[PDB]
Amino acid sequence: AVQQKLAALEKSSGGRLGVALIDTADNTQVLYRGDERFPMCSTSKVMAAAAVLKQSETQKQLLNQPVEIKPADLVNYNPIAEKHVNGTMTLAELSAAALQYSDNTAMNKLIAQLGGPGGVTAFARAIGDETFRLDRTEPTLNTAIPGDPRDTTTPRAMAQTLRQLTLGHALGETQRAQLVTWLKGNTTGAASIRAGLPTSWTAGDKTGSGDYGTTNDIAVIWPQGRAPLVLVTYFTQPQQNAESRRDVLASAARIIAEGL
Numbered sequence: 001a002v003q004q005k006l007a008a009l010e011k012s013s014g015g016r017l018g019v020a021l022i023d024t025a026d027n028t029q030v031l032y033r034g035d036e037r038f039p040m041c042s043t044s045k046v047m048a049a050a051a052v053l054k055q056s057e058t059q060k061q062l063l064n065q066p067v068e069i070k071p072a073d074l075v076n077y078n079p080i081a082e083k084h085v086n087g088t089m090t091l092a093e094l095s096a097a098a099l100q101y102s103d104n105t106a107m108n109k110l111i112a113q114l115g116g117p118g119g120v121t122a123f124a125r126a127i128g129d130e131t132f133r134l135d136r137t138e139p140t141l142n143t144a145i146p147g148d149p150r151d152t153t154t155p156r157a158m159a160q161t162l163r164q165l166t167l168g169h170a171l172g173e174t175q176r177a178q179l180v181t182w183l184k185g186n187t188t189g190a191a192s193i194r195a196g197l198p199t200s201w202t203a204g205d206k207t208g209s210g211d212y213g214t215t216n217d218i219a220v221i222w223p224q225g226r227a228p229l230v231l232v233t234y235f236t237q238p239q240q241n242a243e244s245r246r247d248v249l250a251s252a253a254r255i256i257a258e259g260l
């Protein structure tokens with residue numbers, strides 16, 4: 001029935017919606033197109049930041065390591081990194097910038113710290129995610145071309161890996177808490193999944209967008225009086241120039257919340 005409501009939302013939207021909920025109260029799942037691939041766009045920044053946090057478990061000083069930001073490093077959306085050109089940012093600062101402001105230069109520095117896009121994929125595989133793939137750097141990882149497997153995952157896979165990272169033991173406890181603190185401090189998320197949730201609930205999330213009107217969000221949610229949830233909402237449209245539809249992600253989240 002939740003699936004029929006999500007199918008109606010998808011039909012009126014004109015695009016393709018993918019949803020995965022994990023309710024940790026009973027470990028049950030709600031899926032809609034849960035095994036179809038979608039372009040991750042900036043939701044992939046979670047996996048990159050997490051990979052660096054994993055590295056920091058065996059290098060207690062890694063997050064304080066300075067990284068040079070040169071003018072040539074700036075790409076197309078650099079709200080934090082532009083302030084540090086011809087200077088440096090620590091890996092903590094780069095992680096916070098990538099996660100909480102969606103800074104693309106910051107994401108590129110995280111990718112580089114892992115040895116390139118495939119180092120992020122390797123970390124995904126190391127924590128049991130056989131689906132995620134990062135193939136490109138910013139900004140071209142957001143091209144979001146229909147049918148293109150580059151820089152994609154499925155809703156089912158991303159919900160499982162977000163659960164393992166934020167609620168489970170993919171990371172050490174200090175690192176898990178740091179990731180949750182960053183996600184809870186996101187600045188970009190109020191119009192997306194969180195807009196469809198009761199206001200009493202708390203959450204952290206990472207948004208993403210790209211070409212083909214691609215509009216994404218992945219969240220960890222602490223409802224009032226319930227065990228936490230993990231929710232992934234991915235949305236993509238048939239024309240390259242389509243406008244972003246954060247309202248569709250809100251609507252999907254509202255259908256999920258009403259179906260609990």
Ligand SMILES: O=C(Nc1cccc(-c2nnn[nH]2)c1)c1cccc(-c2ncccn2)c1
Nearest residue numbers: 112113114115116117118119120121122123
């Ligand atoms: O190894 C590096 N990159 C890379 C790219 C794609 C995939 C993989 C991989 N697949 N399975 N396991 N790993 C690894 C790489 C590239 C450039 C620099 C460095 C580097 N690493 C540590 C210190 C300094 N440089 C590593």
Ligand SMILES: O=C(Nc1cccc(-c2nnn[nH]2)c1)c1cccc(-c2ncccn2)c1
Nearest residue numbers: 076077101102139187188189207209210211
């Ligand atoms: O920069 C683009 N989008 C963008 C950037 C930064 C933040 C957000 C955002 N965060 N929270 N709410 N919105 C959205 C963008 C958009 C369209 C096209 C391009 C582009 N860049 C380079 C080549 C081609 N297209 C960038």
Ligand SMILES: O=C(Nc1cccc(-c2nnn[nH]2)c1)c1cccc(-c2ncccn2)c1
Nearest residue numbers: 042077102139140142143207208209210211
């Ligand atoms: O980079 C693109 N968009 C972008 C940049 C930074 C943040 C966000 C974002 N965060 N949360 N929600 N949105 C989105 C973008 C978008 C469209 C096309 C391209 C592109 N870039 C290079 C080559 C071709 N296309 C990039």
